[PDB]
Amino acid sequence: SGTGLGEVDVDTYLSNLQTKTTLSMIADGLERSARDFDAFLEENVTLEWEAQRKRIYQHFGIK
Amino acid sequence: SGTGLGEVDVDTYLSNLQTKTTLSMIADGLERSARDFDAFLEENVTLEWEAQRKRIYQHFGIK
Amino acid sequence: DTTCQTAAMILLNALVHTSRASVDCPIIDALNRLNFIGVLVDSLKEILNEWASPSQQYTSAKLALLLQLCQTRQGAKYVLQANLFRALEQSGVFVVALERHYALLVALARVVGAAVTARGAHNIVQGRKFLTQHRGLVVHVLKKNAILAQQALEERIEELAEAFMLLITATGFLEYE
Amino acid sequence: VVALERHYALLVALARVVGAAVTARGAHNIVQGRKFLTQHRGLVVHVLKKNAILAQQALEERIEELAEAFMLLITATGFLEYE
Structure with missing residues (x-):
């Protein structure tokens, strides 16, 4: 068989390739930014007062 | 019939009466406070700018 | 353009990020002289209107960049002088x-x-x-x-x-x- | 659904006290109102966008009052001018 079976055309094939590459780039950038932010927060919070920062509020505010 | 059918005793009857009176008083007070606040807000907002106050935000903030 | 501004915004994030790894940075300083931080904080207003969609992903990189400048000690000076508190209030x-x-x-x-x-x-x-x-x-x-x-x-x-x-x-x- | 309704009831009570206080004296209290919205920004944005069976209607009613509470403080404090 052949000549077309749930296939696409080259003009649309290249467009789909470019769209997929762009989406993958955006997703990778977002994930890297999120990971960098998480690492920064972990480095800044691991110094001290890990649970006290929330305990003070749980004691002040309504539990 | 008689001598008790899903009934209660006087010692509990008076307690239930007092509890009902207290609950009704609290509910009436809450409802009156809410009505007074609603009337105050209606009197303060009916002056002018009834829909503009929200339109400015709908235009500034994300709809 | 819709894709050029998005790629350009995300590109600045990598420059400032890799520069800190190399307490100050020349990349962030240049942005202030070019009036980039100024106009950038001004665009924060009416963000609700802008916010899969191309406009949504663009705003993500925008706010993401500002978050990086607020991590270095020198960024607080230039960022605070932009009066960002009053910019995020007009947007509601x-x-x-x-x-x-x-x-x-x-x-x-x-x-x-x-x-x-x-x-x-x-x-x-x-x-x-x-x-x-x-x-x-x-x-x-x-x-x-x-x-x-x-x-x-x-x-x-x-x-x-x-x-x-x-x-x-x-x-x-x-x-x- | 009933537990959440009580939560918003507390926020509304506090918002009304602060909202009416700033718009009572005049321009002497607007300086404090702007700090409250800027220091707690984002939270009010979620309420103003949410509004935009018995327990459900009661919960939504509090959201309308809570959403309109902050709106009064904004127009009264003049946060739009600050941008």
Whole structure:
């Protein structure tokens, strides 16, 4: 068989390739930014007062 | 019939009466406070700018 | 263009990021001289109108960049002078659809949270006003945290709840009572 | 559904006290209102966008009051001018 079976055309094939590459780039950038932010927060919070920062509020505010 | 059918005793009857009176008083007070606040807000907002106050935000903030 | 501005915005994030790894940076300084930080904070207004969609992904990189500048000590000086507190107020910004909503609040909370705790006691005066002027809203988030889409939504609540908590302990709102 | 309704009831009570206080004296209290909205920004944005069976209607009613509470403080404090 052949000549077309749930296939696409080259003009649309290249467009789909470019769209997929762009989406993958955006997703990778977002994930890297999120990971960098998480690492920064972990480095800044691991110094001290890990649970006290929330305990003070749980004691002040309504539990 | 008689001598008790899903009934209660006087010692509990008076307690239930007092509890009902207290609950009704609290509910009436809450409802009156809410009505007074609603009337105050209606009197303060009916002056002018009834829909503009929200339109400015709908235009500034994300709809 | 829609794709050029997006790629350019994300590109600046990599430049400033890799520069810090190399307490100051020449890349962030150049942006201030070119009036880039100024116009950038001005665009923060009316963000609700802008916010898969091309406009949504663009704003993500925008707020993401500002968050990086608020991590270095020198950024608080240039960023604070831009008067960002008054820019985010005119916009009135303060299962999958809701998840995106919290994503915007988290991005803004992180930029403000990191900015106050960057310089020192010179910005705490502004942080207290933000929590007092917008009191109650944060209380609902801090109490909420205390299938796939559900976990994603709850995750944002944890980050959003912890975002304000960092500003409280860093600003010292407990002392004000 | 009933537990959440009580939560918003507390926020509304506090928002009304602060909202009416700033718009009572005049320009002497607007400086504090701006700090409250800026220091607690984002939280109010979620409420103003939410509004935009018995227990459900009661919960939504509080959201309308809570959403309109902050709106009064904004127009009264003049946060739009600050941008």
